[PDB]
Amino acid sequence: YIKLKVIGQDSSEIHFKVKMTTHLKKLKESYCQRQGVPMNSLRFLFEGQRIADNHTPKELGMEEEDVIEVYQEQTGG
Amino acid sequence: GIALSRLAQERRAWRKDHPFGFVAVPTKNPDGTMNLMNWECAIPGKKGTPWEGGLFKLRMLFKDDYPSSPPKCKFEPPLFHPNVYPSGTVCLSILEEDKDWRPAITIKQILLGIQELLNEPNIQDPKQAEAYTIYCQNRVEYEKRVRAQAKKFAPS
């Protein structure tokens, strides 16, 4: 279990506590729900790497209080 | 100039043949004359859906580039629906000139496409935060709100 700070371009900082082996797609779902933004309209980055759905914190080498960056390619819909 | 002629052709066709329960009438100007650029419409709820019993009025606004350009459809008052802006504006692929809009699309085809949109929302492109949240979390609460607003707009 590690806490992750999820940052967006809109200065949004939402924290999530996840297990080291859960697929990071669940964190995308919790960001979609807590922000009311469609999940398919967001890109999640760890370092300079787009976070895949089967990627896990253990695989990406994430640690406590690491930061994930979120981009929204749909400027209008 | 061509818009007013196309809109007048549509008004006559709607009078003669139009789907049951729908309304589509041009508004009036402050001087009483007819304004074919602003229509007051109404879309009836489908039986068997949480929308049944309610008549949801919306407004169609036409620009001078009609029918080369699509009309702007705004629900008045704004509807609780995941694809309706908090301002009432309805987005649909046929209502985006850079998408699926063609000049042949009549008023009848737009009101039917919005009617279908009510019970079958496009969850991939939500335009309202509140209805997209409730629909993707507590569907029972979503239905209760729709039925509450269906009874709110029921023809009394």
Active site residues of B: 91
The Cα B69–Cα B7 span in angstroms is 13
Q: Please, is A54 exposed, middle or buried when counting C-beta atoms within 10 Å of its C-beta (0-12, 13-18, 19+)?
A: exposed
The Cα B10–Cα B106 span in angstroms is 7
For residues B74 and B90, the answer to whether their CB atoms sit within 8 Å is: yes
Tell if the CB–CB gap between B133 and A36 is shorter than 8 Å. Answer: yes
Q: What DSSP character marks residue A25?
A: H
Contacting residues for B36 by C-beta, under 8 A, at least 6 apart: B3, B4, B7, B8, B11, B26, B62
Q: How many angstroms away from the CA of A36 is the closest CA of chain B?
A: 5
The Cα B89–Cα B79 span in angstroms is 9
**Chain A residue closest in CA terms to B123:** A38
Q: How many angstroms away from the CA of B79 is the closest CA of chain A?
A: 18
Residues of A in contact with B136 (CB under 8 A): 32-33
The secondary structure of chain B, three-state, reads: CHHHHHHHHHHHHHHHCCCCCCEEEEEECCCCCEEEEEEEEEEECCCCCCCCCCEEEEEEECCCCCCCCCCEEEECCCCCCCCECCCCEECCHHHCCCCCCCCCCCHHHHHHHHHHHHHCCCCCCCCCHHHHHHHHCCHHHHHHHHHHHHHHCCCC
Residues of A in contact with B137 (CB under 8 A): 33
Residues of B in contact with A29 (CB under 8 A): none
Among the listed residues B59, B48, B14, the one whose alpha carbon sits nearest the alpha carbon of residue B143: B48
Phi-psi region of A45 (alpha: psi -120 to 50; beta: other; left: phi over 0): beta
Fold of A2-71: Ubiquitin-like (UB roll) (3.10.20)
Tell if the CB–CB gap between B126 and A36 is shorter than 8 Å. Answer: yes
Q: Which of B96, B136, B139 to mutate against chain A (most A CBs within 10 Å)?
A: B136
Identity at A59, one-letter amino acid code: E
Which residues of B touch chain A, with CB atoms under 8 Å apart? Answer: 91, 123-127, 129-130, 132-133, 136-137
Q: Domain ranges for chain A, please list them.
A: 2-71
The Cα A32–Cα A39 span in angstroms is 5
**Residue B55 belongs to domain spanning:** 1-156
What is the resolution in angstroms? 2.8
Q: Could you give the residue ranges of the DSSP H alpha helices within chain A?
A: 25-35, 57-60
- Is residue A75 within 8 angstroms of chain B, CB to CB? no
Q: Which of A12, A33, A73 to mutate against chain B (most B CBs within 10 Å)?
A: A33
Q: Tokens 């039986």 identify what position? A: B47
Residues of A in contact with B129 (CB under 8 A): 36
Q: Tokens 């079958």 identify what position? A: B120
- β-strands A66-71, A2-8 pairing: parallel
Using CB atoms, pick whichever of A33, A36, A38 lies closest to residue B124: A38
Q: Which residues have a C–N gap over 2.5 Å right after them in chain A?
A: none
The experimental method, as deposited, was X-ray
Identity at B72, one-letter amino acid code: K
Query: Total domain count for chain B?
Result: 1
